[PDB]
Structure formats: structure tokens, C-alpha cells
Amino acid sequence: PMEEEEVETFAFQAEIAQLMSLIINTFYSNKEIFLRELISNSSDALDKIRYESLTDPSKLDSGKELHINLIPNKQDRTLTIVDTGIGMTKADLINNLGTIAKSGTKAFMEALQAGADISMIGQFGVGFYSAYLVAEKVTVITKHNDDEQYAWESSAGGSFTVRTDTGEPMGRGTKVILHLKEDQTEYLEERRIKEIVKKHSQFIGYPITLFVEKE
Numbered sequence: 001p002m003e004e005e006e007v008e009t010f011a012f013q014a015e016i017a018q019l020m021s022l023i024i025n026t027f028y029s030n031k032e033i034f035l036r037e038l039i040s041n042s043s044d045a046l047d048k049i050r051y052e053s054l055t056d057p058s059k060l061d062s063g064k065e066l067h068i069n070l071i072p073n074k075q076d077r078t079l080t081i082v083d084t085g086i087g088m089t090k091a092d093l094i095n096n097l098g099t100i101a102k103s104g105t106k107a108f109m110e111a112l113q114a115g116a117d118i119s120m121i122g123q124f125g126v127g128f129y130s131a132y133l134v135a136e137k138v139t140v141i142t143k144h145n146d147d148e149q150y151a152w153e154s155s156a157g158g159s160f161t162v163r164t165d166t167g168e169p170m171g172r173g174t175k176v177i178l179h180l181k182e183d184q185t186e187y188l189e190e191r192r193i194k195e196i197v198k199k200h201s202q203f204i205g206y207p208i209t210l211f212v213e214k215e
């Protein structure tokens with residue numbers, strides 16, 4: 001039969017929309033730091049499940065290995081960062097990735113306007129949005145122990161969507177899929193990926209694996 005799926009469309013908080021617009025439409029050198037921000041979010045999420053699981057071991061039933069995978073796909077021009085962290089509930093997606101004001105947003109846009117390096121984004125509580133330095137669209141698939149699997153997605157322009165994900169089940173964690181802009185395909189090259197992890201993500205406390213599809 002025909003599947004029915006529910007979708008919800010949300011407006012970004014005004015300054016978050018403003019920051020997304022600034023990141024998308026301004027030229028920045030040093031855009032490679034997007035990967036650092038996404039790995040450091042996976043790292044934080046893995047911290048979370050590791051500690052929760054000291055309190056209750058059954059939080060690892062959904063999978064015991066705590067790691068980060070990087071999956072560039074030169075065919076569909078996506079770079080996917082997968083972690084087996086804590087994941088996000090539905091409400092976690094809606095609140096943390098776009099509806100709720102971040103206290104640092106305004107200070108970051110002034111910094112940037114004054115000529116700060118886009119690298120500073122990590123200090124302002126808004127590093128997720130560095131994904132739009134390189135991606136025209138971002139899909140986040142996520143599964144938390146307390147909820148079903150969901151898909152968040154935005155091509156920016158002021159809105160994002162959240163829907164139950166009926167794609168491939170993940171046991172627990174988060175998958176960020178960057179649909180890369182046509183001039184940012186260097187981020188699918190295994191040497192560039194390696195270079196930037198070594199530079200910026202060198203002291204992350206969980207194993208990182210790079211998966212390269214056979215040329």
C-alpha cells in the first residue's frame with residue numbers, strides 16, 4: 001500500500017536565520033573547520049552516553065561501541081559524519097537545532113562582521129551551522145534511547161523539517177549528511193579529510209574511522 005508519513009516544518013529563530021544567511025552568502029577562508037565542529041559535537045554526544053551508561057548499563061543495549069565514522073561519497077557528493085552518541089529526541093532536534101535563541105549568536109555575527117576567522121564559531125555556541133560553509137543541504141538522522149528515529153533537514157532559507165525516519169534503522173546516535181556545494185568537493189577526498197582531522201580533531205577521545213569507497 002501507499003505509506004503515509006508525518007512532516008513538520010519549523011521557522012529558524014530570527015538570529016539563527018541571520019547567521020545561516022551570513023555563513024552561506026559570505027566568502028570565508030578556512031572553511032575546513034566545519035569538520036572539527038561536527039566531530040566535536042559527536043565527541044560531546046559520546047561523552048553523554050558514556051556517562052549516562054555508568055548510571056544505567058541498559059543504555060548501551062542499543063550498542064556498546066562508542067565511535068565516529070566519516071563517509072565521503074563522491075557519487076552523490078555527500079560527506080556523512082556518523083556517531084554512536086546519545087542521539088536526539090524529536091524535541092531535542094526542534095529545540096536545539098533551530099527554534100531556541102542561542103545567547104552567543106549576536107556576538108558571533110558582530111565578531112564576523114569585524115573580520116574574525118570563521119574558526120571562532122566554536123566559542124559562540126553555534127558551531128553546528130558551520131556545516132553550511134560547505135553544504136547546500138544538511139540532513140540529520142538521529143536516534144535517542146527515549147524516542148524513535150527522526151530526520152531533520154534544511155536547505156536554509158529560514159525553515160527546516162522534522163519527520164519520523166523510516167530509512168535504515170540506526171541503533172543509537174546521530175548521522176549528519178552534508179550535501180556538498182559544487183565548489184566544495186575537496187572534502188570528499190580521503191587525503192583532505194585526513195589532513196583536516198589531523199590538524200583540528202587530533203585529541204578526540206573516541207576512535208574515528210574513514211570509509212573510502214574503492215576507486
Ligand SMILES: Nc1ncnc2c1ncn2[C@@H]1O[C@H](COP(=O)(O)CP(=O)(O)O)[C@@H](O)[C@H]1O
Pocket residue numbers: 037041042044045083085086087088096097125126127128129173174
Ligand atoms: N552529533 C550530535 N549528537 C547529539 N546532539 C547533537 C549532535 N550535533 C549537535 N547536537 C545538538 O546540537 C546542539 C548545538 O550544537 P552546536 O555545535 O551548534 C553548539 P554546542 O552545544 O556544541 O556548544 C548541541 O549542544 C547538541 O545538543
Ligand SMILES: [Mg+2]
Pocket residue numbers: 037040041127128
Ligand atoms: Mg558544538
